[PDB]
Amino acid sequence: EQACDICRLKKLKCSKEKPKCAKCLKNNWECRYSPKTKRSPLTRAHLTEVESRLERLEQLFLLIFPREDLDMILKMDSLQDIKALLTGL
Amino acid sequence: EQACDICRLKKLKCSKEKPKCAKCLKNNWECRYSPKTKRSPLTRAHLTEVESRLERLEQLFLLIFPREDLDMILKMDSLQDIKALLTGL
């Protein structure tokens, strides 16, 4: 049922046999069944919890930045830089 | 499929006919079919838009103020409280 890391990336049918499978035995390959990777729950209640948090921060930032491209700031990645910027408060 | 407003509110089978229906007609009430309520899409792309912007507003918030404040805002429902928070600077 779970396919192997590689068959997964290569997208071919997996034989699925453990410990090494079809191809991964053949091409003498590093065959892993990596564990099931978590996501946050897609439920309505959780969408809504997260939308309520986002609204409140969104509101708090309308007052910090009444003037624009908050989105400019939101895209930056550098900490010094962002902080150099803000010290134009 | 859609039940009338009153049957919905009361949770009894609706006849659903046109215009009115059995119990609004009988019981003497103004039977309505309200529009479905617009909600946000519960897709994964959309939960991720929203979790990942909330995260980045949290990251920026923390260059400006202490983490203990993050936690307060993330819970406030009152617009005076979100603003006062900011006023104690």
Add this chain to the structure above:
DNA sequence: ACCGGAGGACAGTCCTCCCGACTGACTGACGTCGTACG
């Protein structure tokens, strides 16, 4: 080879709506008091 997307089992929504519990109201029964008669 490689990878866009078809295919499909599955996760979880989001409707209408049946069913059970709880509360209120109404009716009946009993008890107590008051009046009348011996």
Add this chain to the structure above:
DNA sequence: CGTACGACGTCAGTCAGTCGGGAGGACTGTCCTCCGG
């Protein structure tokens, strides 16, 4: 004066109705695998 009967009032029990938890289930959209171009 004392006893008995009737009437009224109060309490309990039963039934009905209504808010509610939530079952049922069609459906929306996920999130895998792996086809075939």
